[PDB]
Structures are given as C-alpha cells and as structure tokens.
Design a protein around this ligand. Structure first.
Ligand SMILES: Nc1ncnc2c1ncn2[C@@H]1O[C@H](COP(=O)(O)OP(=O)(O)OP(=O)(O)O)[C@@H](O)[C@H]1O
Ligand SMILES: [Mg+2]
Lengths: 123, 103, 205, 31, 36, 512
C-alpha cells in the first residue's frame, strides 16, 4: 500500500506493521527446512520466532458478518486503535504463553486472551 | 587562531573525566564537556564580500541599495567589548566555586 | 576583515586575563599585613574563542541577510518587468482576435485573397502583404511609445514594488532577526535543569 | 563533585554573546 | 523456497570457522619454527 | 536594460516573424485500426518522418511498402476515418530543448501538460541520432552522488556511465531515483557549477496520479527547479511510450554537448518494450520470443549507448542514465532483463525478502556491481569502501551457521556483531539523502569497529545525533573532506577520537 508511510499514518502504526512483516518473513525463510526436519535443531531465538509467527498469522484471520452462515460464528469489527494495540502487545510477547488456537477467528486480543485463560482455567 | 588553540582545553577536561568514577560524577563531566564544546565551536563559513556598486548598477529601486548599504555598514561597526567581559570574569566568579577551591 | 577584528579582540581578552597575576599580588599584601590551576586559563580562553567565533557567525548572519534582501528584491523586480511585457503581448493577441471580429475586417479578407492569389500564382506562399502583422505592430508601437518616456518614470514603472511586495521583504528581515535571536543552545536536555540555566533560556530573547 | 561547581560557574557566564547580539541587532533594522 | 542457498551458506560458514582456527595454529607453529 | 529598450527589442522581434508555406504532398488513409493507419500515395515520404492528419494529430511513417505506408497515430484515433487526408510535414520527429524546460512537465512530443504556460524555447533536436563515437568519449572519473549510503559506497556511479536499477514491484526502485534528485539540490543552491546535475525523469506507462504525487514531492523539497519530467502514461498511445525515452535522452544531449551534466531516469523500460511490441505487432511485423520484435535489444542499446562522458575538447559534458527494469518473480533470466544487463555497466538488484526483513533500501550487495569501480568514488571513500566490502562478505557467510550451530566463537562473534551494525547503518529512510562527507564519517565509525559497542537498535539514532554534533561543533573537518575530497591522517585521528567519546557521552545502550 502506498498509504503505508510514517507521515500519513502514525509512526506507531508503521513500526507495528513493519515488525509483523519482518516477523512473518523471517518465519517464511525457515519453512523449507522446518518441513524437511523439525524445529528441534532450530535455535532458541528462531523457535521463539516460529511460535510467535504462528500466533500472529492465526490472529490475522477474523470472522466476517457476511461469512457468518459459513462458519456459524458472529462477525467482528476491529477499530484501528484496538488492532494496533493487539499486534503491539503480541509482538512484545503478551499472548506467547497461551496456545495458538485461542487466536483463531478472534476480533480483538482481549477475546483471544479470555478464551486462552478459560482453557488454562479448565485444566 | 583556528588551529591548535584548543588542545590544552581538551587535556584538562580529559584528566577531570578520568578522575570521575561514580555515575553522577560521570554525568557531571558530560555536562562540563558539552559546555566547553559549545563555547569553543569554531565557525568557518567564508563571510562573502558585498559589491554594493554592482547591485546599484545592474538594477534596483532608487535609494534602496544605498539605504541597505548605509544601514548594513552602521551595524558592521558594532563589535563585542571583550575587555568588559574579561575583567568581570577574571575579577570574581561563583564564590561558591571559590569555596570549593579553598579545600 | 572580520578576522582582523577577531584577532585584535582575541588578544584583548588574553591581556585582560593575563592581568590575573595582579590579584595574587593583592592577596600577598593582605598576608604581609597579617601579624585545577588551569581552570582560570581554560575558562578565559574558551570565552575568548567563543566570542570570536560568535562574532564571526553574527557577521555572516548580517551579510547574509543584507544579501538575501537585495537578491529577493531583484527577483521581484524581474517578475514585475515580465508581468508588464506579458500584458503587452496579451493586448497584441486580443488585437488579432478583435480583427477576427467585424469592425473593418473586410480589407483583411480582401488582402488575404490578394496575397493568396499571389501564393497560388507562385510555388510557395509568403505573407508579405498580410495586414495582421502591421495591425499588431501598430498597437504594440503605440504601447512602446507610451512606455518610452524617460528613465525617471521607468525607475518606478519598470519596478513597481507594491507596499505588500516590500512588506514581505521587511517581514523576512524581522523574522530572520527573531529566528537568529530566539535560537537557543541545544545541550544535554535533562541535565540543564539548574534554575539559572532555565531562567536564561526563558529570558533568551 | 568539583565538576558540579565548575559546571555551575561556566554556565553562569552563558548568554553574554546572545545579549550582545540583541543590543547590536536591536540597534538598527537593516531593511 | 531455496534449499540450495541454505546448504551453500551452511557449507561456507562451517568451513570458514574450522579453517580460520587452522590458520591461527599454522601461523603460531611456523612462527615458533622460524624464530629457531 | 531599460524597460523601454527591452520593449523595443520585443517589438522588433515580433516584427521579424517569417512564415512560408510550400506544396506538401498528401495521401489518403486506406484503413485505420488500433492506432495504425495504412496510407495510399504520400510518396517521397521519408522513413520515420512525421505526418499530420485533418484534426491535427501527428503520425510517424514507419513502414514504407510498395503499395501503402504504415503510420502510427501519436494520440487518440477516433476522429480518423477512411479517405481522410494525411499531410507530410517533411521533418523527422524532434523535440524542443533548452534550459527553460527545467521545472516543467512535458509529454513525449514535448508539449507542456503543466498548465503554467507555453514553452519559450527556440532549439529543436532530432530524437533519433547516431550515438557518440569512440574518440569523443572519455574515461568516467567524476562521482554522481545519489545520497544512498549503500550505493555511494558499494556501487559507485560515475558521471557518464549507465547503472540499471532492476527489481520486483514495490522494492524501492523509484525511491532511489527520487533520492538522487534531492541530493543534487544542494549543489544548485550553492554556486558550484562543476557539480550541478540536471535530473530528467521519464515516466513510461504510469498512472498520472503517481507522477503528480512525485512532482508535489519535488516541489516540496524545491528540487523541481532543476528537474524535467517527461510523461507517457498508460492511457497514452503506445508510440508515445516508445518515443518518450528517446525524447528525454535528446533533451539530455543538449546539456551533454554544452559542457553540462545531466541525469536521465528511464522509468520501467519493460513498459517501453511492451509499447514497441504492440506498435510493431499491429504493423504486421513478425514476432519474436515472447512476441517481442527481433530488434528489441537494438531499441534499448541505441537508447542507452547515447549516455557518455564527452572529452574536454567538446566541453566535458556528460549524460548519466539510470534505467529501471521490473522483474516478475525475481527472475533476471527473462528476455528483456537479460538484454539490458548486457547493455549497461552495472546493475543494482532490489530484493523483496530484504525489503521486508527491515533492509531498506533493499539492495543485494552480492550481485550489485559497477564497472567504473572506485574510479568514480572520492579519495576519502575508496579507503573505507574496500574494508566495508570485505566486512559485508564475512557477515553473510556466518549468518547461516549461527542460526543452526547456535555456538559462537569470540572472534566470530565480533565479526558477526560488526557486520550486523554495518547492515543497520546502511539502512536509510525515504526522502532523506545524505551528504557524501557525512557518509564518510558514519561509514568510518562502522568499519573502525566503534559501532560494535552500542546496541544495534541505537545505531540509526546515533547516526542522526552524531551527524548533527559534527555539523555544529566540527564544521572545518567536513569542509576539508568536501573540498579536498580526501580523508587526511589528521582528520582520521580527530574523527577517531571524537567517535568513541560521543558514544560514551550521549545516552545510548552501550552493551553490545
Ligand atoms: N528507504 C526506504 N525506507 C523505508 N521505506 C521505503 C524505503 N524505500 C521505499 N520504501 C517504501 O517502498 C514503497 C514504494 O517503493 P518504490 O515505489 O520506490 O519502488 P517501485 O519499484 O517503483 O514500486 P512500483 O513497481 O509499484 O513502481 C513504498 O511503500 C516506500 O515507503
Ligand atoms: Mg516505480
């Protein structure tokens, strides 16, 4: 997008977007080897990157209102502020402790944390 | 004036910073070094000479070039009075500083 | 020449500082009645160098302002002259357009027919007899004769610097002064919190 | 701590050239 | 998707480390030998 | 000159206006379609000659056949009809050249689309002319400062050479050219003619909105006063996109032949090739591989070979070209990219992976190269660039081992850290060109190993802070590096002393 620049949009918005792209690109550069052989021989920092990239890739997905009949779950509308905060906290490592399934088809980070916290609570 | 007149000014501050060990002492030395560099900042921009006749000749509004010249000339005369500043700074300065020097 | 004043002032501050051995004599006299050493030199030399380099910077600032004002004036004058000539050209174009209208356009078509028959009679066509060029020249010569009066009136006619035109230059000078003066030093930020420093900055002016 | 006293003193004598410029430049308006 | 570049980088890096150490050893041993 | 005297000269000039008309052979259009007109008659017409239709739009006579003539319409062909008249002007395609072009926006033919006013010029140059011979040229020995650290140090560009900015979409190709134009602005403001570089930007097959934003950016930085923009947008006819690069190059030859220096930036030449392919296929010419005509290589070569460094006998002028090439999926093995690489001197490869990993400008130093080499760089530059290149190669080699081996030696760890600091230093924002002398200081701090102290995340801000500190406190040093163009030993020592000192004073993260 041409609109993605520090002057047009907030500098915070730009840093978060670039961080996500850098995280995803780093993970994408490792998918071949991880496919051939597991992540065990992978470094500790690279394994953290892999875990965090899975979380973010899952969190990117969101249910739509028009797609409500297909999935059967209510759609979500995410304000820009909530979106940036969610991804900022995720890059910082807020939801790393929880499982990646809690981020699937969630509107905002708080929704994913509540589901993840309930899963931690159930056991 | 430009070269070599600031070397001694650096050795003095270097020793003073070497004496400082505590973080606060190191920070005070940083403040001191900033002040010294600010005062000793050299300026070299090749002040250009003005040919008022060339401007007066080529084109200008009647009386404008000469008025600019006389006003510019009047201001160039003014200059710092280093004598007055030197005496006050050499006479007395920061009695609190003098207290520190007593011991 | 400013460097000359720089070196002269430089020695003056040095001599005043050199006086400082005089104070020690005064102390000796007081002691007789009774019955870090480099800090002074570094401080003295720094202020002298500071004043010298600062004097040079101010000289550049004044000459630069004096030069920019005159250059900006010249640019405005060229624009004024260009606008006057552009007005002249627009009158010429309007004369052609008016000629396209009625009001003595018959001779133009008649003259064109004569010139056109000539061109047909010849291999090529040249507008030696077209009335458009003399017609345009007549208007332009009238305007030229009108402007050609004497250099005196041209002094203002050529360069009609409007009050707002000169006002803009004057506002730049005042703004330049405020920018040069209000420009405050940029040292360590969270370290210059002493009351005297903040006071000096607030009253920088 | 000696550096702290020196800093205060040296800072006391700042603004001299700035005030000098104010006078010299407030002297006349170039225009 | 480039596994060939991965192997090439891996190969180059490991060779450099091992043979950099060997170069250190070789300079020391020959220096000891050249001095006498 | 008095206003009255000037007006008299103007009146006299208006007086001496000549206008001759001669019998011009005309033909009829046998057919018209897709912008191609088959014309009957119109004999004694020269190949490449311009022709004029009834409405007033021009055409270029490319195909001379025994039966008819194949003309390409330089515009919209809706008004053209069978049996219409086609008048031969008698002159090969040409464009107005001069200094008044600067600060304007033209089309391929040279008509101004700014809306400011008519073009006040008297010189018209032929678009297609034989390139300079072997004798007129001269060795390239002057730097063309782009303002990009990575480029000015690793891939130096010399005035008179041809560098190819090749990459995929959205990799920062246009950004490099814009940054180059901005850097030139300082020289024009200061009265140093020996370094002024007129910038020409040829936009081929681009949405007018993009060019408008670019012109606004140039005006914002006041860099438009010395720039010329030639526009052949997507809506424009294919022949216009085909002639725009050649039109711009002729405008540059003006400066070249007149002892001046000009930088011409051809936006994607792949788009020019597409337009030429279209214009040729519609002419029924046999297609080559990927449907491109057989002589597409000749198209680009004849264009780019124009750029040269004329000898001192002719004025020492120079024309520097920065053609842009867009690749589909990073395959530089394609037909058009392959040809252009063989034509130019060096190529700057832009990679998408590097772009998203934070490496912006996304320049692949491993592939990028310049024939001129250090012959263009300044003395102070070459010294640092050699060590910088050697450091970069070592860092790339050890990157893979660290990820999997997960064990780092003291010597390797230092080299690994040093390379990382440099890569962070080479990063640069957009619309932020750096002076060459400031580059030397920053690159100096890097290669000497000082940057290894502070954390990587702080290297970029140290650059800004340290550059400001130098500009304020140490201005004579910068003037020496600039005027002399060399990094003396005294400057080395002075710089080597203040760098570590500043790192320790300012508030940074010192732990490596
Ligand atoms: N040095 C840079 N630093 C940060 N961002 C950059 C930098 N350079 C480019 N970008 C970003 O790259 C995008 C545009 O890249 P650019 O248009 O210059 O390359 P391009 O090859 O011309 O793309 P296209 O094929 O669409 O024309 C923008 O989003 C810009 O913000
Ligand atoms: Mg582009």
């Amino acid at each position: 997008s041409r609109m993605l620049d520090p002057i047009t949009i907030g500098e915070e918005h730009y840093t978060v977007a670039r961080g996500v792209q850098k995280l995803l690109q780093d993970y994408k550069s490792l998918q071949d080897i991880i496919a051939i052989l597991g992540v065990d021989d992978l470094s500790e920092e690279d394994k953290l990157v892999v875990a965090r990239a899975r979380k973010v890739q899952k969190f990117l997905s969101q249910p739509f209102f028009m797609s409500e009949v297909f999935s059967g779950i209510p759609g979500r509308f995410v304000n820009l502020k909530q979106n940036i905060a969610s991804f900022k906290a995720l890059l910082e490592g807020a939801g790393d402790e929880y499982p990646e399934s809690c981020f699937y088809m969630k509107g905002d980070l708080e929704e994913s944390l509540a589901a993840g916290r309930a899963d931690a609570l159930k056991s | 004036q430009a070269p070599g007149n600031q070397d001694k000014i650096l050795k003095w501050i270097s020793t003073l910073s070497n004496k400082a060990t505590t973080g606060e002492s190191r920070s005070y030395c940083t403040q001191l070094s900033s002040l010294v560099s600010f005062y000793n900042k050299q300026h070299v921009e090749q002040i250009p000479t003005i040919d008022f006749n060339e401007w007066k000749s080529v084109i200008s509004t009647q009386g404008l070039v000469d008025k600019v010249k006389e006003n510019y000339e009047s201001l160039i005369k003014e200059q710092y009075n280093t004598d007055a500043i030197s005496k006050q700074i050499s006479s007395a300065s920061s009695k609190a500083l003098d207290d520190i020097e007593n011991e | 020449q400013v460097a000359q004043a720089n070196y002269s002032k430089f020695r003056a501050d040095y001599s005043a500082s050199v006086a400082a051995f005089q104070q020690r004599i005064k102390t000796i006299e007081k002691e007789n009645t009774g019955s870090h050493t480099s800090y002074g030199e570094i401080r003295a030399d720094s202020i002298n160098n500071f004043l010298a380099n600062e004097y040079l910077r101010l000289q550049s600032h004044i000459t630069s302002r004096a030069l920019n004002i005159l250059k900006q004036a010249q640019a405005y004058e060229t624009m004024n002259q260009a606008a006057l000539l552009q007005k002249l050209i627009d009158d010429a174009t309007s004369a052609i357009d008016n000629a396209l209208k009625g009001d003595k356009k018959a001779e133009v078509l008649a003259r064109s027919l004569d010139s056109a028959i000539d061109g047909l009679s010849k291999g090529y066509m040249d507008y030696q007899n077209d009335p458009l060029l003399p017609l345009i020249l007549s208007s332009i010569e009238a305007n030229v004769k009108k402007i050609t009066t004497l250099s005196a009136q041209e002094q203002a006619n050529l360069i009609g610097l409007t009050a707002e035109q000169l006002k803009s230059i004057k506002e730049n000078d005042v703004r330049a002064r405020k920018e040069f003066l209000e420009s405050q030093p940029k040292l360590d930020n969270n370290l210059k919190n002493i009351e005297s420093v903040k006071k000096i900055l607030a009253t920088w002016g | 701590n000696m550096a702290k006293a020196y800093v205060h003193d040296i800072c006391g004598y700042i603004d001299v050239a700035n005030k000098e410029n104010v006078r010299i430049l407030s002297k006349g308006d170039l225009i | 998707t480039r596994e060939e570049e991965w192997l090439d980088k891996r190969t180059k890096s490991q060779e450099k480390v091992y043979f950099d150490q060997e170069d250190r050893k070789a300079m020391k041993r020959l220096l000891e030998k050249l001095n006498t | 000159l008095s206003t009255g005297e000037a007006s008299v000269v103007l009146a006299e000039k208006i007086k001496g206006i000549t206008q001759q008309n001669d019998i011009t052979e005309y033909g009829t259009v046998i057919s018209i379609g897709d912008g191609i007109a088959r014309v009957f008659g119109l004999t004694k017409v020269q190949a490449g000659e311009m022709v004029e239709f009834k409405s007033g739009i021009r055409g270029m006579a490319l195909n001379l056949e025994t039966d008819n003539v194949g003309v390409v319409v330089l515009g919209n062909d809706r008004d053209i009809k069978e049996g219409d008249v086609v008048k031969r002007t008698g002159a090969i395609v040409d464009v107005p050249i001069g200094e008044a072009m600067c600060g304007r926006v033209f089309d391929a033919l040279g008509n101004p689309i700014d809306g400011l006013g008519p073009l006040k010029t008297t010189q018209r140059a032929r678009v297609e002319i034989k390139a300079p011979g072997i004798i007129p040229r001269q060795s390239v020995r002057q730097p063309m400062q782009t303002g990009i650290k990575c480029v000015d140090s690793l891939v130096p560009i010399g005035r008179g050479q041809r560098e190819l900015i090749i990459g995929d979409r959205q990799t920062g190709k246009t950004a490099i050219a814009i940054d180059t134009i901005l850097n030139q602005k300082e020289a024009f403001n200061t009265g140093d003619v020996k370094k002024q570089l007129y910038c020409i930007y040829v936009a081929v097959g681009q949405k007018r909105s993009t060019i408008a934003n670019l012109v606004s950016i140039l005006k914002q930085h006041d860099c438009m006063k010395f720039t010329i923009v030639v526009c052949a947008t997507a809506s424009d006819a294919a022949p216009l996109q085909f002639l725009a690069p050649y039109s711009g190059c002729a405008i540059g030859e003006f400066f070249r032949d007149n002892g001046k220096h000009a930088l011409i930036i051809y936006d994607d030449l792949s788009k020019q090739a597409v337009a030429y392919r279209q214009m040729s296929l519609l002419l029924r010419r046999p297609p080559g591989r990927e449907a491109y005509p057989g002589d597409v290589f000749y198209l680009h070569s004849r264009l780019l070979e124009r750029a040269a460094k004329m000898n001192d006998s002719l004025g020492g002028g120079s024309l520097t070209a920065l053609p842009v090439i867009e690749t589909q999926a990073g395959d530089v093995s394609a037909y058009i990219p392959t040809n252009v690489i063989s034509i130019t001197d060096g190529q700057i490869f832009l990679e998408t992976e590097l772009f998203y990993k934070g490496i912006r400008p996304a320049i692949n130093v491993g592939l990028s190269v310049s024939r001129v080499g250090s012959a263009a760089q300044i003395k102070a530059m070459k010294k640092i660039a050699g060590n910088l290149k050697l450091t970069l190669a070592t860092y790339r080699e050890l990157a893979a081992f660290s990820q999997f081996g997960s064990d780092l030696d003291a010597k390797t760890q230092q080299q690994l850290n040093t390379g990382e600091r440099l890569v962070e230093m080479l990063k640069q924002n957009q619309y932020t060109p750096m002076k060459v002398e400031e580059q030397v200081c920053i690159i100096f701090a890097g290669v000497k190993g000082f940057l290894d102290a502070l954390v990587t995340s702080e290297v970029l801000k140290f650059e800004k802070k340290f550059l400001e500190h130098v500009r304020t406190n140490h201005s004579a040093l910068l003037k020496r590096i600039r005027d002399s163009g060399d990094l003396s030993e005294v400057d080395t020592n002075e710089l080597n002393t203040i760098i570590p000192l500043f790192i320790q004073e300012g508030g940074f993260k010192l732990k490596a």
